Design a protein around this nucleic acid. Structure first.
Length: 87
DNA sequence: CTAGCGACTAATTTTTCGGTTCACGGTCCCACAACTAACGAC
Protein backbone atom coordinates (compact mmCIF):
# COMPACT_ATOMS: atom_id res chain seq x y z
CA UNK A 1 0.00 0.00 0.00
CA UNK A 2 2.78 2.44 0.90
CA UNK A 3 4.72 1.70 -2.28
CA UNK A 4 1.59 2.09 -4.42
CA UNK A 5 0.77 5.39 -2.71
CA UNK A 6 3.99 6.88 -4.15
CA UNK A 7 3.95 8.59 -7.54
CA UNK A 8 6.85 9.00 -9.95
CA UNK A 9 8.63 12.33 -10.37
CA UNK A 10 8.57 11.75 -14.13
CA UNK A 11 4.81 12.39 -14.03
CA UNK A 12 5.68 16.09 -13.65
CA UNK A 13 7.34 17.36 -16.82
CA UNK A 14 10.68 19.09 -16.23
CA UNK A 15 10.45 18.27 -12.54
CA UNK A 16 14.20 18.87 -12.17
CA UNK A 17 13.66 22.51 -13.17
CA UNK A 18 11.03 23.67 -10.67
CA UNK A 19 10.90 20.96 -7.98
CA UNK A 20 13.17 19.27 -5.42
CA UNK A 21 14.73 22.53 -4.26
CA UNK A 22 16.56 23.86 -1.24
CA UNK A 23 17.92 27.16 0.08
CA UNK A 24 21.44 27.34 1.59
CA UNK A 25 20.23 30.03 4.01
CA UNK A 26 18.46 27.28 5.96
CA UNK A 27 21.68 25.25 6.19
CA UNK A 28 23.70 28.25 7.36
CA UNK A 29 21.03 29.08 9.95
CA UNK A 30 21.07 25.50 11.22
CA UNK A 31 24.85 25.59 11.58
CA UNK A 32 24.61 28.95 13.38
CA UNK A 33 22.09 27.45 15.81
CA UNK A 34 24.47 24.53 16.37
CA UNK A 35 27.30 26.98 17.11
CA UNK A 36 25.07 28.84 19.58
CA UNK A 37 24.28 25.59 21.39
CA UNK A 38 27.97 24.67 21.46
CA UNK A 39 28.86 28.07 22.92
CA UNK A 40 26.21 27.65 25.62
CA UNK A 41 27.58 24.21 26.50
CA UNK A 42 31.14 25.60 26.63
CA UNK A 43 29.91 28.31 29.01
CA UNK A 44 28.37 25.60 31.20
CA UNK A 45 31.57 23.55 31.11
CA UNK A 46 33.58 26.61 32.16
CA UNK A 47 31.15 27.21 35.03
CA UNK A 48 31.40 23.57 36.18
CA UNK A 49 34.81 23.79 37.97
CA UNK A 50 33.47 26.60 40.17
CA UNK A 51 30.97 24.21 41.79
CA UNK A 52 31.55 21.87 44.71
CA UNK A 53 33.50 18.75 43.80
CA UNK A 54 30.69 16.30 44.59
CA UNK A 55 28.16 18.27 42.54
CA UNK A 56 30.67 18.61 39.70
CA UNK A 57 31.27 14.86 39.57
CA UNK A 58 27.52 14.25 39.73
CA UNK A 59 27.06 16.36 36.59
CA UNK A 60 30.10 14.87 34.85
CA UNK A 61 28.77 11.35 35.40
CA UNK A 62 25.29 12.49 34.35
CA UNK A 63 26.83 13.74 31.09
CA UNK A 64 28.63 10.51 30.18
CA UNK A 65 26.05 7.96 31.33
CA UNK A 66 22.99 10.17 31.61
CA UNK A 67 20.60 10.99 34.45
CA UNK A 68 20.83 7.38 35.66
CA UNK A 69 19.78 8.02 39.24
CA UNK A 70 19.78 4.31 40.10
CA UNK A 71 23.23 3.34 38.84
CA UNK A 72 24.63 6.62 40.17
CA UNK A 73 23.09 6.05 43.61
CA UNK A 74 24.70 2.61 43.95
CA UNK A 75 27.95 4.11 42.65
CA UNK A 76 27.81 6.96 45.17
CA UNK A 77 26.23 5.55 48.33
CA UNK A 78 23.30 7.92 48.58
CA UNK A 79 19.84 6.58 47.80
CA UNK A 80 17.70 7.30 44.77
CA UNK A 81 15.98 10.14 46.63
CA UNK A 82 19.17 11.72 47.99
CA UNK A 83 20.97 11.42 44.65
CA UNK A 84 18.05 12.96 42.77
CA UNK A 85 17.92 15.80 45.30
CA UNK A 86 21.65 16.48 44.90
CA UNK A 87 21.36 16.45 41.10
C1' DC B 1 59.10 66.35 72.97
C1' DT B 2 55.11 64.42 76.28
C1' DA B 3 51.27 64.50 78.89
C1' DG B 4 46.68 66.84 80.60
C1' DC B 5 42.45 68.80 78.90
C1' DG B 6 38.25 70.81 76.52
C1' DA B 7 6.67 13.30 44.29
C1' DC B 8 10.14 11.24 41.17
C1' DT B 9 12.17 7.06 39.54
C1' DA B 10 12.38 2.12 38.59
C1' DA B 11 10.15 -2.32 37.85
C1' DT B 12 6.60 -5.09 35.85
C1' DT B 13 2.58 -5.93 32.87
C1' DT B 14 -0.60 -5.71 28.81
C1' DT B 15 -2.27 -5.00 24.40
C1' DT B 16 -2.85 -3.73 18.52
C1' DC B 17 -0.68 -4.73 14.28
C1' DG B 18 2.15 -7.48 11.31
C1' DG B 19 3.86 -12.05 10.13
C1' DT B 20 2.83 -16.66 9.00
C1' DT B 21 0.12 -20.54 7.23
C1' DC B 22 -3.58 -23.22 4.62
C1' DA B 23 -4.02 -24.21 0.20
C1' DC B 24 -10.29 -28.10 -5.96
C1' DG B 25 -14.47 -28.78 -8.48
C1' DG B 26 3.13 9.58 -37.42
C1' DT B 27 7.30 10.97 -40.85
C1' DC B 28 11.62 10.63 -42.81
C1' DC B 29 16.01 8.58 -42.82
C1' DC B 30 19.84 5.07 -42.26
C1' DA B 31 21.22 0.28 -41.41
C1' DC B 32 20.61 -4.89 -40.97
C1' DA B 33 18.74 -9.44 -42.10
C1' DA B 34 16.25 -12.25 -45.83
C1' DC B 35 16.06 -13.42 -50.09
C1' DT B 36 15.76 -14.40 -54.73
C1' DA B 37 16.56 -14.10 -59.64
C1' DA B 38 20.27 -14.47 -62.55
C1' DC B 39 25.19 -15.97 -63.46
C1' DG B 40 29.24 -18.87 -63.46
C1' DA B 41 31.75 -23.37 -62.24
C1' DC B 42 32.09 -28.71 -61.72
Amino acid sequence: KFHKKVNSLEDYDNYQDYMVGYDPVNDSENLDEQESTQKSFDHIKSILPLLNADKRHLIELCLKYGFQYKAISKVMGKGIHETSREI
